[PDB]
């Protein structure tokens, strides 16, 4: 039913693929049962990795999330069939190759990442690993897609005390106290991501810098943008903006549509 190409991607395994039934580009992701720590049960109650549970919850309708087309269980692994846009580049390679992004471009990207995380939250899913590496850019359509829910969880309003995401994007309350709330931790990670986009790299590498609450701009960044980043990176969780507050921020106004973004910046 699928024709398996070559590796696309570390310690993970995602292959290029084409569905024989219609030559749809697919990505085929393999996950070892030995390395799955979080398990769940589906709408019908079969015991599956949480990643599958969360992909299913976010994968209906159109969105800025890579959609799970199907999945199979094997003796020692699960296989996941996912969307594959073409042509594509992840946001980390794109920032490495092009450097600090122009603000107009960062704005279109960031806005779309906001819509995609809103969509996850609305569906009951916390990704917990928002970062340039987990964002694909469809270079023709100018659309971003979130990937890799392998560190995610069901969204809840109570405190989280576990976390297997990327440390340099984790908030100071996690570093200092081994606890966080979902949304407010998500917003912190989005402030790291925004800095990453407009400065060409993330702002912190060491714990002490994360907990330190000091944001140095290494590039010229407009002051409405600096203010949004600094707001998202408030040390105290309750001082961070809500998603609505991020999207109503003056830096966020007059966002380009995706085609426009593709035509102006990607083609």
């Amino acid at each position: 039913q699928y024709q398996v190409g070559p590796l696309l991607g570390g310690f993970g395994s995602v292959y290029s693929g084409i569905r024989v039934s219609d030559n749809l580009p697919v990505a085929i992701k393999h996950v070892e049962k030995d390395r799955i720590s979080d398990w769940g049960e589906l709408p019908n109650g079969t015991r599956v990795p949480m990643e599958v549970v969360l992909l299913k919850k976010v994968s209906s309708g159109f969105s800025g999330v890579i959609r799970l087309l199907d999945w199979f269980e094997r003796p020692d692994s699960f296989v996941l069939i996912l969307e594959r846009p073409e042509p594509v580049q992840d946001l980390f390679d794109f920032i490495t190759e092009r450097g600090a992004l122009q603000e107009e471009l960062a704005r279109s990207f960031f806005w779309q990442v906001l819509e995609a995380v809103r969509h996850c939250h609305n569906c009951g899913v916390l990704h917990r690993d928002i970062k340039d590496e987990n964002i694909l850019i469809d270079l023709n359509r100018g659309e971003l897609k979130l990937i890799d829910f392998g560190s995610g969880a069901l969204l809840k309003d109570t405190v989280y005390t576990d976390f297997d995401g990327t440390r340099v994007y984790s908030p100071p309350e996690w570093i200092r106290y081994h606890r966080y709330h979902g949304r407010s931790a998500a917003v912190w990670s989005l402030g790291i991501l925004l800095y990453d986009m407009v400065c060409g790299d993330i702002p912190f590498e060491h714990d002490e810098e994360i907990i330190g609450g000091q944001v140095f701009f290494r590039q010229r960044v407009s002051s409405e943008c600096q203010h949004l980043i600094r707001w998202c990176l408030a040390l105290r969780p309750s001082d961070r903006p809500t998603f609505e507050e991020i999207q109503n921020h003056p830096w966020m106004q007059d966002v380009l549509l995706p085609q426009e973004t593709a035509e102006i910046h990607l083609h």
Binding site: F11, T96, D129, K131, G150, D164, T166, D201
Partner: peptide, 7 residues
Amino acid sequence: KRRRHPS
């Protein structure tokens, strides 16, 4: 100086 960071 710029690098990826695994989960």
